[PDB]
Amino acid sequence: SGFRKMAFPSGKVEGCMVQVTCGTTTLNGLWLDDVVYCPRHVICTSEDMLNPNYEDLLIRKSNHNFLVQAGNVQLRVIGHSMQNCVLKLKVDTANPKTPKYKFVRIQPGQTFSVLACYNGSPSGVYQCAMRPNFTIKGSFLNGSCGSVGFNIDYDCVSFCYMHHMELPTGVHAGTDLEGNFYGPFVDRQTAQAAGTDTTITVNVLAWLYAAVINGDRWFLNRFTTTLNDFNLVAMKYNYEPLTQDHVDILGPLSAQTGIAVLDMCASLKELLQNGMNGRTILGSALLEDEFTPFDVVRQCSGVTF
Amino acid sequence: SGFRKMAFPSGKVEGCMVQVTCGTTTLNGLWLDDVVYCPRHVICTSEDMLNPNYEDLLIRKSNHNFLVQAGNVQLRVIGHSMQNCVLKLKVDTANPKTPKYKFVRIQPGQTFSVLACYNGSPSGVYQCAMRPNFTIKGSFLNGSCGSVGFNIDYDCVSFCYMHHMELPTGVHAGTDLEGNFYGPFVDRQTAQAAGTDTTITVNVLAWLYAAVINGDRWFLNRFTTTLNDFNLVAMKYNYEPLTQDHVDILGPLSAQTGIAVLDMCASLKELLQNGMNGRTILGSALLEDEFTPFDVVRQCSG
Ligand SMILES: O=C(Nc1cncc2ccccc12)[C@]1(O)CCOc2ccc(Cl)cc21
Ligand SMILES: O=C(Nc1cncc2ccccc12)[C@]1(O)CCOc2ccc(Cl)cc21
Known part of the structure; x- marks a missing residue:
């Protein structure tokens, strides 16, 4: 539980986190194989950040301008290139901890x-x-x-x-x-x-299924709704529209708890129009939207890494 | 922010997590140096459930009864001993990832x-x-x-x-x-x-200081309280009594925000009395008590 x-x-x-220093700026880099990835704004000064030309700034940089530090070992930069807003620093050593x-x-x-x-x-x-x-x-x-x-x-x-x-x-x-x-x-x-x-509607529904799995059932009701009627109400409360893909991904939780997705949507609809009435769900007075349907299954079934 | x-x-x-198996029970062990630590209840059968005699059960076990698995490598148990409710399985390999x-x-x-x-x-x-x-x-x-x-x-x-x-x-x-x-x-x-x-009062106060540092000030009030008057109110809401040690540990946050501990205690009393009025503190509609004063300083100051 x-x-x-x-x-x-x-x-x-x-095992991939390294420190990247360029001039006075120090930030983090991701060392994968023989490349260190980091935000390209590491090459900026105070004037540069206001209106920057990153192609112009990078062209003026040499490999020795970037100080890469992996733990207590300095990595030697043998190349630099830019891909959109990320800077790629080619190093001489491949990260042996690269997953x-x-x-x-x-x-x-x-x-x-x-x-x-x-x-x-x-x-x-x-x-x-x-x-x-x-x-x-x-x-x-x-x-x-x-x-x-x-x-x-x-x-x-x-x-x-x-x-x-x-x-x-x-x-x-x-x-x-x-x-x-x-x-x-x-x-x-x-x-x-x-x-x-806006509120991530499919995630709130997934978290309501996690609450039912944990024995919190007070918010359940006899009612069901159409996906269209639910979306009209949800949009009124700044909730993301629920698509058929979302109903489909919520299928396993619906089968595990015995509560259809549109049945849970009618509970969510009432929770939005009437509030929680001083009650909580999973020790929370607000509807949680940072658990996806996959997160709920992974946690309530114990998938390991 | x-x-x-x-x-x-x-x-x-x-890098220390291993699998420990004894009979039909499988659980996790912590492999540090050449010892694997795990709950002693791994040695329990269906009969040694309500009133197990762990000294008696462990004495009947041999090193070859414990199957320790670190990834896809079986570790060899060369000794076993019990320290209170933890079982210590001496293994023939020191964990090279021991921090x-x-x-x-x-x-x-x-x-x-x-x-x-x-x-x-x-x-x-x-x-x-x-x-x-x-x-x-x-x-x-x-x-x-x-x-x-x-x-x-x-x-x-x-x-x-x-x-x-x-x-x-x-x-x-x-x-x-x-x-x-x-x-x-x-x-x-x-x-x-x-x-x-009960609610961990010092942790709620630390979290209220974190909210002030993050610009959430709506719950602040012009009141202060005595530590005794605050404890009388807090105890009615199932809140832990706040000791002088707690006031002292809250000192740096009080100095950083310019709000005295007893001044923040008066804000906490008001929150318990009124509720949130549909507002949130740091995106939460309930008072959070799982951030210590040390956590708040680490997360906010660095
Ligand atoms: O609580 C246990 N295990 C679990 C531990 N964590 C979470 C679980 C969730 C779902 C079921 C079981 C859980 C026991 O191993 C079995 C039940 O009785 C006792 C009684 C005493 C002891 Cl020291 C262990 C256990
Ligand atoms: O946002 C930044 N850095 C920070 C990033 N995260 C959290 C922070 C918290 C407290 C202060 C700074 C933070 C800047 O480096 C500062 C100046 O404005 C810009 C503007 C654009 C860019 Cl791409 C970076 C930055």
Whole structure:
């Protein structure tokens, strides 16, 4: 029993964290094979960050300008190239701790674990969701840039995020491991604002199934709804529309608990229109949306890595 | 900015997780140097359930009865001994991934990361607090026994918990790494009940300081209180009494935010009286008590 926000074991990723220094800027890099990946803004000064020409800045850099440190060993940079907003530093040594990995771009609503680092040293691991507005509600201080988001599939690390910046509202923006930002963000010191956030509906439903699996049933009701009627109500409360794909992925939980997806949707509909009435679900007074249907199955069935 | 429930990176602990099998029971062990630590209840059969005599059961076991598996390598048990509720299996190989470590017994309110394992394989990492009633509100299925709780301050792993059992209410009980249980619990299937849980008051205050550091100030008020008046109100909401030690540990946060401890205590009294009025503090509609004063400083200041 029990339900917790659970991150993937971070060991396979800790073996890849290195420190990258360029001039006065120090941030984190991901050392996979003979390449170190890090945000390209490591090459920026104060004037540069305001209106940067990264192609122009990188062309002026030499390999000896980048100081890469893996533990207490300096790695020698033998090449540099840029792929979108990520800088790729070719090193002479292949990381012997390189796990089986893949670079994956995730969709909003999907979850992943974040290994927060400072000076190439991992300090914390937390689980979070890629918000529908493409920000992550992370916990990052200055120096955390280059920290990565990942999932583990069997024994394969799927790298899906690299931290680049903090928006004025305290939320965070970053890119996939190919340098493409999630969201309408740019890596420059400029007025940027995250769009209005919405609730990840399929995740709330998955978390309601986790509550039923844990014996919390007070919110269940006799009612069912149509997917269209549910979406009309949910959109009114800033909830993401639920697609047929979401109903399908919720199938195993629906079969395990004996509560159809549209039956759980009628409970969610009532929870939205009437509130929780001083009651809690899994010790929470708010509907949780950072557990996907796969996360709930993985936790309530004990899948190991 | 931002505030999250954050676990320590689990890598240093993953390299120590092994699978221990005795008869039909399979659980997890912690392989440090040439010793594998695991709950002693791995030696229990269906008859040694309510009233097992572990000294008697262990004496009947031979080294070849314990099957230790580290990945796809069977480790050879060359000795066995019991220290309280933990079994120590001496193996013929020192774990090369053994980190710098220490065994630490924690107090209620202390937080730690849990590496939940099944069959010696880590499946997730989450963050816990030792509840004032000595249970932990974990997430564990059958087979999770032997999973460990830890803190990583600097290069050193402080092992503070080993999972042994699930109480009838879904909460969990375990021991430190010397086999001493936290709480009035025994490793028997006899009727056991956790005492009524209470909120870790010093941790809520630490979390309110984290919210102020993150710009959430709506709950602040012009009031201060005496420590005694605050404790009288808090106790009515099943909150732990706040001691002078707790006021002292909250000193740095009080200095950083400019809000005295007793001033924040008055804000906490008001929150207990009114509720949140549809507002959240750090994205939460309930007062969070699983962040210690030390966690808040580490996460907010660095
Ligand atoms: O956001 C940044 N860094 C941080 C990233 N995460 C969390 C933080 C928390 C506290 C301070 C800084 C943080 C910047 O390096 C600072 C200046 O503005 C930009 C603008 C664009 C870019 Cl791509 C980076 C940065
Ligand atoms: O609680 C146990 N195991 C579990 C431990 N964690 C989580 C679980 C979840 C679902 C079922 C079982 C769980 C026992 O091994 C069996 C039951 O009685 C006792 C009694 C005493 C002891 Cl020291 C262990 C156990």
